[PDB]
Design a protein around this ligand. Structure first.
Ligand SMILES: [Ca+2]
Length: 500
């Protein structure tokens, strides 16, 4: 074969997959119909995504991958416009036909700052990592066909000779091109049904200046220096600044609003839907008095999908090509980076033994499809908890306790790897987790809390239960399971800023 591995898509997922494989001695070809620089959403890093990048870096000995996990390192090595800063997630709740209250907020702060990724700069830098380790890249191409054979894969291209490899990876951020032709993609059975409008803006006012200062909120973090979620019954809006870092030079702020299609369907053009949203929620409008759009609004009428399979003898779909639920909680990048970390060693074994059977990659599929299902439950139940602040306040502890447990588990895996230097042991440890794709990874007590909490929320939606009933039911579940969670005081509802 001309190449060991062909990768579709040259964003961060495809580029980092290409880098680790090329560093490990494979001949890699990255194909993309787009070209750099180009825009992309999926901007909010998490503690999980940070640890996964550091794991990728350490597992494959590529120090530059670890720069992408911390904003100071991004500023220094990628560039001063390449990120904003994030000291936590903040959630501010609103309701139609009532003034918004600065006490209807929750914001768990971080120990260590994470990044708001300016993806045009981040992704190009990541492609450069791959290129410097020997991966070939072809941009602005047109794939005529993909053929999956006994002996390999053939990709036909427009105005060029066909290219051959042993294996193909679909790392495309959108479209799921291999998923299309294989008939694997479906919306059947998903609880989440949401649309999205997104763009980048100049002169978006900070939360502190527009709505309420730190003296009024009593928040331990500036909401300006956080991934801000404005939440309400039928949907939510993100405020993700790139212009909030003291050494940063980016002027933009990412803005996206999502609707639950069961509750509200948009009928008009994006700027009209935006102005109607700000009329419904004048508190949110305070961000945008002097703001101007720095690109066209993108509308996606349904962002949710999944796939019935995602690996074969000669292929693997990375998580973005397999399934997506919603930007809420930024679970997409988490799933993506863990999947690469699980897949890459198996592709190396396969390339070195020349054995290419679906069974070799079954744990990659298991993690991916379980992650998407969990993500679907988490988000759909969250969209229901948007109906009331007190309900949201109680419910958000279910997400937080899980995520805290998952991060702690990933940190432990990193620490073990760094002190032993044992890559096989790490690969086995990640594969041996009891709940791959779930928020905790390995806590039966947490996953009991999660599953019963999700049941409470789905019943509440199906039978239109009172929000005070639903909140109390969740609160008792947290109290029941609290002893087996990290000791952060998840059950004390009066504390709206759960500190590490
Ligand atoms: Ca080779």
């Amino acid at each position: 074969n001309q190449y060991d591995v062909i990768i579709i898509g040259s964003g961060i997922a495809g580029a980092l997959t290409g880098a680790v494989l090329a560093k490990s001695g494979l001949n890699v070809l990255i194909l993309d119909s787009a070209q750099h620089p180009r825009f992309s959403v999926g901007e909010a890093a998490t503690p999980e995504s940070g640890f996964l990048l550091r794991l990728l870096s350490k597992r494959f000995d590529i120090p530059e991958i670890a720069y992408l996990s911390h904003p100071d390192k991004i500023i220094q090595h990628v560039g001063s416009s390449a990120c904003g800063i994030k000291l936590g997630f903040s959630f501010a709740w609103h309701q139609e036909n009532a003034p918004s209250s600065p006490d209807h907020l929750v914001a768990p702060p971080l120990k260590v700052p994470e990044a708001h990724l300016f993806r045009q700069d981040i992704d190009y830098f990541a492609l450069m990592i791959a290129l410097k380790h020997g991966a070939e890249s072809r941009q602005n191409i047109k794939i005529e066909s993909i053929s999956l054979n006994d002996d390999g894969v053939e990709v036909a291209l427009s105005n060029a000779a066909p290219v051959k490899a042993a294996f193909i990876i679909d790392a495309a951020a959108q479209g799921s091109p291999l998923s299309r032709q294989l008939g694997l993609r479906t919306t059947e059975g998903l609880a989440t049904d949401t649309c999205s409008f997104f763009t980048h803006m100049l002169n978006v006012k900070s939360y502190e200046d527009a709505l309420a200062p730190l003296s009024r909120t009593r928040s331990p973090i500036e909401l300006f220096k956080s991934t801000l979620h404005h939440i309400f019954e039928e949907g939510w809006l993100w405020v993700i600044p790139f212009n909030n870092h003291p050494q940063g030079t980016n002027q933009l702020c990412s803005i996206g609003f999502q609707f639950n299609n069961a509750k509200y369907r948009p009928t008009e053009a994006p700027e009209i839907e935006f102005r109607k949203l700000l009329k419904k929620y004048p508190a949110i409008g305070e961000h945008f008095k002097d703001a101007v759009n720095a690109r066209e609004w993108i509308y996606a009428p349904r962002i949710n999908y999944r796939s019935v399979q995602n690996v074969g003898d000669r292929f693997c779909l990375l998580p973005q090509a397999t399934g997506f639920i919603d930007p809420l909680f930024s679970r997409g990048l988490i799933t993506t980076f863990e999947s690469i970390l699980r897949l890459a060693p198996k592709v190396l074994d396969a390339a070195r033994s020349n054995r290419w059977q679906r069974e070799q990659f079954i744990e990659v599929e298991r993690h991916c499809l379980n992650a998407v299902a969990t993500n679907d439950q988490l988000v759909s139940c969250s969209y229901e908890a948007f109906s009331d602040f007190h309900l949201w306040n109680v419910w958000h502890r279910v997400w937080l306790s899980g995520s805290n447990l998952g991060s702690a588990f990933l940190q432990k895996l990193l620490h073990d790897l760094e002190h032993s230097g044992d890559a096989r042991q790490f690969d086995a440890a990640l594969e041996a987790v009891r709940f791959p794709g779930c928020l905790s990874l390995d806590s039966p007590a947490y996953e009991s809390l999660f599953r019963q909490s999700c049941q409470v929320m789905q019943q509440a939606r199906e039978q239109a239960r009172p929000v005070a009933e639903t909140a109390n039911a969740l609160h008792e579940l947290i109290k029941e399971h609290e002893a087996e969670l990290l000791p952060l005081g998840y059950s004390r509802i009066s504390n709206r800023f759960i500190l590490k």
